[model samples]
Target: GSSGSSGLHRIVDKMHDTSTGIRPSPNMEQGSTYKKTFLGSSLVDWLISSNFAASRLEAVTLASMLMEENFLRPVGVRSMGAIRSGDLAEQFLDDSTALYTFAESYKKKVSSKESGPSSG
Candidate 1:
């Protein structure tokens, strides 16, 4: 039964699991705090290791699906711009420099938490 992207969320749900699944970590982007992030290289590795895909090509395909499903949002100037470029083919580089983050993770500040409280 063909449909409009059903059941794809299970993959995302699995990836988001804290244990026995792909977890997020902090990474640097242009020497800035690219917090709560994941790398494309590691993503491919997980896809392969998790048996979600047999080969790199298949892994990329799965990852691209995640991107299209709008769960895995591209981070960094390059990849986000790639999305804005409106060229689907150029998206998802899956390279060493590539970056991504969940849409819900789109918040916060990089420390300065030595000790401070908000007045608001």
Candidate 2:
């Protein structure tokens, strides 16, 4: 529905740093890496405060999840290996699934009404 599309637009907007996609520099790779660091740090900082059920663990868990997913997206070829070179990757532990399950679970958690995108 509108909510999912809204969220997607938001993500794209943030990715573009605005809807226009005007970048500050020649290397969007560097820009994307910087974005990941900002995102990772922001999550960890929030976890430090919100303290959800196992909040630190959960934040760390989620952060680690993000890092891995970003890696899977194969963004490492970009700026200086976003998390690892920054020394933040050391804090992350690995998570792997036989097949990617994020979309199936994420929509259920996000909107709670789940007729999702077709798999095949």
Candidate 3:
């Protein structure tokens, strides 16, 4: 049991696979609405509640590490601001209002957004 992206992978695996883990809910950011997103605090809580991490400090760091690796994307304007700020300390927000989503979910929306045919 010492595998799976070192730790976060198994957790996220459980997250997306069930309605129980880090339950994704509709979240809005500056008028832009996103689905299946979780609060930054909720993510940290997931790790703690699941007994994957011992404290908020550990969970936050792990989540931030995952963010750096693109496992999750900061979606809220508040959260996104920190990431674009390019400050190491601002990379991940543990605030309850901060929002996040799986990169895969975000990717699908961008990729599926109205593409055109060559009319061939």
Candidate 4:
């Protein structure tokens, strides 16, 4: 049984919207420093409002995941492009194992930041 198919679809659809660049949801909190710093206030707002991210850590993690996976690429102040069609994009759609592995790696990177200085 899959518990995340619909949720994953929603996230992917939002990411595909190049016009919005995954605009923040309407009801997200006003000012979150961590989101503002890492994910940007607008995107953090969207993730939270859309329920894609329920916590600060999740928001940051998801944002980093989207970028690191190449589902999104940073361009201007907050512009991004969808992978469209490629191995990376296909893996994003078909590889749950890869997603889990990347999540673990991202968590490890975040943890390292807390302990001391190190490269991610």
TM-score of each: 0.70, 0.27, 0.68, 0.37
**Deviation in Å, model 3, residue 39 alpha carbon:** 0.7
* Global lDDT scores for all candidate models: 0.68, 0.34, 0.69, 0.41
lDDT of 4 by residue, 1-120 (tens): 333344554665665565644532222223322121223444455566668878655655555556554344332222234533233222122111111111222212245436666578
Model 2 TM: 0.27
lDDT of 3 at 39: 89
By descending TM-score, how would the candidates be arranged?
1, 3, 4, 2
Best by lDDT: 3
Candidate 4 least-lDDT 10 residues = 94-103
Query: Model 2 over residues 27-100: C-alpha lDDT tens digits?
Result: 23323322322333333444344342155566555444433433212222322234442333534422211111
Estimate the lDDT of model 4.
0.41
Task: Pick the winner on lDDT between candidates 1 and 3.
Answer: 3
Regions more than 4 Å wrong, model 4: 1-9, 18-21, 24-39, 75-120
lDDT of 1 at 97: 75
Cα RMSD of all models vs. native, in order, equals 7.6, 12.7, 7.1, 16.3
Error of 4 at 92 (Å): 19
Error of 2 at 35 (Å): 7.5
RMSD (Cα, Å) of model 4: 16.3
**Tens digits of per-residue lDDT for model 1 on 40-108?**
766767777878878776777677667666667788844666364233353666666788776663223
TM-score comparison, 3 vs 4, better candidate: 3
